[PDB]
Copies of this chain bind each other. A is one copy, B any other.
């Protein structure tokens, strides 16, 4: 058969490791041109060619909280592959503190990436992709932590709940104005990534059946494939909705 992302041009923030890496990998596999971003250009450069050549994928150093860099990022992708059709706001960071124990510096730093960065990408994505008949799709990475609380992830919970509902606002406005832009959120449960790998004992803790009923954590390809569905015209009637891939975590 045929490529499910034929002619799509996608920005994937934080697309050099973990979930964002797999999203970029499967996007290219389905016919899309991809620009991945990340802060470490060393790590980011080798990540880009691990997927493919510069005719299908490229890396652009960019901090998702860099508002002005977002305009340059859209310009660079546009001159490389054509008008952007797909924005995956995946960059995010974690902070292992209860609300009580969160410093204001930790709070502000996490939210600048996890919330302001997603806002910058969604806002500019709408401005740059509306009214061009592109079948445009903005995919905002929330989490199961946008649906349930966690006593030791207070700031993260705030950021992911914000992404959850802000995305609905954007989806509604785009729909009511016939912008031809959809906005949806993805809510992964625990996924084996560097973020999880570097937290001591995280995978074993979240493999408890009282946490993930399947008794194991997921893999980055599990999130890649739902983003492929959401970037594709297969999902042209899906907007403002929450897509949960979590091993049953939130079902109990």
Contacts and interface: CB of A to CB of B under 8 A. Distances in A.
List of 4 A-B pairs having minimum Cβ-Cβ separation, nearest first: A240-B251, A149-B168, A161-B165, A151-B173
Interface stretch (A55-63, A80-88, A95-103, A196-204): A95-103
Residue of A148, A161, A165, A244 with most partner-chain B CB within 10 A: A165
B251 A246 contact: no
Given A171-B213, A237-B247, 9 more contacts: A100-B126, A100-B127, A149-B167, A150-B172, A175-B213, A175-B247, A219-B237, A240-B246, A240-B252
Contact of A242 (B150, B213, B244, B247): B244
B107 A172 contact: no
A154 B147 CA distance: 19
Interface in A145-200: 145-155, 157-173, 175-178, 189
B229 A175 contact: no
Given A149-B168, A151-B176, A162-B159, A241 B244 contact: yes
A154 to B, nearest CB: 4
A250 interface: yes
Residue of A149, A225, A247 with most partner-chain B CB within 10 A: A149
Interface of A: 1-3, 29, 67, 98-100, 102, 104, 107, 111, 115-116, 119, 122-123, 126-127, 130, 145-155, 157-173, 175-178, 189, 209-211, 213-215, 218-219, 222, 225-226, 229, 232, 234-248, 250-252
12 contacts: A102-B119, A111-B111, A149-B167, A151-B177, A151-B252, A158-B165, A159-B162, A175-B214, A213-B239, A237-B246, A239-B247, A241-B245
A141 to B, nearest CB: 15
Contacts of A1: 2-3, 29
A105 to B, nearest CB: 11
